[PDB]
Structure 1
Amino acid sequence: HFSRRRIAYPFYPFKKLGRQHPKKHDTNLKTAMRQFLGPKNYKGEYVMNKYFTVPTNHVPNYIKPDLERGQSLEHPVTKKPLQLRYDGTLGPPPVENKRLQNIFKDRLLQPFPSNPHCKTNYVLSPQLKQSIFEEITVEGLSAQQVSQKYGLKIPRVEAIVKLVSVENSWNRRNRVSSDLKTMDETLYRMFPVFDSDATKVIYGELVEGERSQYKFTNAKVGKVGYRYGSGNRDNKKDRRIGFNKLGQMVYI
Structure 2
Amino acid sequence: FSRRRIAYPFYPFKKLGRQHPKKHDTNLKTAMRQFLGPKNYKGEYVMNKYFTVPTNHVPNYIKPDLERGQSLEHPVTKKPLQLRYDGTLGPPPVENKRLQNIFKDRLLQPFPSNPHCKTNYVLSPQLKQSIFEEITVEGLSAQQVSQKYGLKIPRVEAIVKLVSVENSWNRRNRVSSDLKTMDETLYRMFPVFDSDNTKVIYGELVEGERSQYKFTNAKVGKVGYRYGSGNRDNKKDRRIGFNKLGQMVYI
TM over 0.5: yes
Query: Is the 2:198–2:217 contact (alpha carbons within 8 Å) kept by the matching residues of 1?
Result: no
Instruction: Note closer, same or farther for the CA distance 1:54–1:248 as it changes in structure 2 (3 Å cut).
Output: same
Following the alignment from structure 1 to structure 2, what is the Cα–Cα distance between the partners of residues 69 and 30?
18
Query: Is the 1:203–1:212 contact (alpha carbons within 8 Å) kept by the matching residues of 2?
Result: no
What is the CA-CA distance between 1:11 and the residue it aligns to?
0.8
Partner of 1:103: 102
Instruction: Note closer, same or farther for the CA distance 1:92–1:199 as it changes in structure 2 (3 Å cut).
Output: same
Once the two structures are superposed, residues 36-56 of structure 1 have per-residue CA deviations (whole angstroms, 9 ceiling, x without a partner) of: 101110001212101111000
Scaled by the length of structure 2, the TM-score of the pair is 0.94
Once the two structures are superposed, residues 179-200 of structure 1 have per-residue CA deviations (whole angstroms, 9 ceiling, x without a partner) of: 1111111111000111341955
Following the alignment from structure 2 to structure 1, what is the Cα–Cα distance between the partners of residues 199 and 61?
54
Following the alignment from structure 1 to structure 2, what is the Cα–Cα distance between the partners of residues 215 and 9?
67
What is the CA-CA distance between 1:122 and the residue it aligns to?
1.0
Once the two structures are superposed, residues 153-210 of structure 1 have per-residue CA deviations (whole angstroms, 9 ceiling, x without a partner) of: 0111011000000011111111012111111111110001113419552127578898
Query: Is the 1:73–1:83 contact (alpha carbons within 8 Å) kept by the matching residues of 2?
Result: yes
Instruction: Note closer, same or farther for the CA distance 1:22–1:207 as it changes in structure 2 (3 Å cut).
Output: same
Following the alignment from structure 2 to structure 1, what is the Cα–Cα distance between the partners of residues 50 and 224?
62
Could you say what secondary structure the match of 2:241 adopts?
Answer: strand
Following the alignment from structure 2 to structure 1, what is the Cα–Cα distance between the partners of residues 50 and 197?
32
Instruction: Note closer, same or farther for the CA distance 1:5–1:179 as it changes in structure 2 (3 Å cut).
Output: same
1:67 maps onto 2:66 in alignment: yes
Query: Is the 1:68–1:98 contact (alpha carbons within 8 Å) kept by the matching residues of 2?
Result: no
What is the CA-CA distance between 1:139 and the residue it aligns to?
2.4
Once the two structures are superposed, residues 109-146 of structure 1 have per-residue CA deviations (whole angstroms, 9 ceiling, x without a partner) of: 00011100001011001111010111112222221121
Could you say what secondary structure the match of 2:182 adopts?
Answer: helix
Q: Is 153-162 or 211-220 further displaced after alignment?
A: 211-220
Once the two structures are superposed, residues 13-67 of structure 1 have per-residue CA deviations (whole angstroms, 9 ceiling, x without a partner) of: 1110111101111111111111110111000121210111100011000001110
Scaled by the length of structure 1, the TM-score of the pair is 0.94
Following the alignment from structure 2 to structure 1, what is the Cα–Cα distance between the partners of residues 122 and 90?
37
Could you say what secondary structure the match of 2:98 adopts?
Answer: coil
Following the alignment from structure 1 to structure 2, what is the Cα–Cα distance between the partners of residues 26 and 55?
33
Work out the percentage of aligned pairs sharing the same amino acid.
Answer: 100
Query: Is the 2:150–2:195 contact (alpha carbons within 8 Å) kept by the matching residues of 1?
Result: no
Query: Is the 2:204–2:212 contact (alpha carbons within 8 Å) kept by the matching residues of 1?
Result: no
Q: Is 97-106 or 160-169 further displaced after alignment?
A: 97-106
Instruction: Note closer, same or farther for the CA distance 1:141–1:110 as it changes in structure 2 (3 Å cut).
Output: same
Instruction: Note closer, same or farther for the CA distance 1:86–1:209 as it changes in structure 2 (3 Å cut).
Output: closer
Following the alignment from structure 1 to structure 2, what is the Cα–Cα distance between the partners of residues 51 and 167?
31
Could you say what secondary structure the match of 2:65 adopts?
Answer: coil
Following the alignment from structure 1 to structure 2, what is the Cα–Cα distance between the partners of residues 154 and 186?
27
**Alignment length (residue pairs):** 251
Instruction: Note closer, same or farther for the CA distance 1:207–1:147 as it changes in structure 2 (3 Å cut).
Output: farther
Structure 2: gaps spanning 5 or more residues: none
